Amino acid sequence: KKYAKSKYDFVARNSSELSVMKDDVLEILDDRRQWWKVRNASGDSGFVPNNILDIMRTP
């Protein structure tokens, strides 16, 4: 598993995007595009722009 942390808030504009709050931690499910599919605190999943995120690293 991979995780990223949000530096900013993000508000979903339609059913497919996913809302996030500053400092939220997210599980990166698909990082292949400009918008990553992530799973947030609610367990739901959706796309969020990656530029608001910082990938978190671990050995």
Side-chain angles (χ1 to χ4, degrees):
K1 284 188 182 176
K2 296 171 56 171
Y3 292 87
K5 182 172 60 155
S6 198
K7 301 190 284 284
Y8 314 97
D9 293 335
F10 168 68
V11 178
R13 263 65 157 185
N14 62 63
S15 159
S16 172
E17 301 175 342
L18 181 85
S19 282
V20 311
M21 310 285 252
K22 174 180 185 297
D23 285 331
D24 261 6
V25 58
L26 311 150
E27 184 187 357
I28 301 161
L29 305 185
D30 187 339
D31 62 8
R32 301 173 299 173
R33 317 167 177 68
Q34 183 174 211
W35 287 52
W36 296 345
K37 191 169 60 177
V38 298
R39 169 175 291 132
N40 73 356
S42 78
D44 187 3
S45 59
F47 288 75
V48 178
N50 87 267
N51 78 329
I52 62 168
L53 319 172
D54 275 335
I55 165 96
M56 292 186 276
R57 303 178 194 54
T58 172

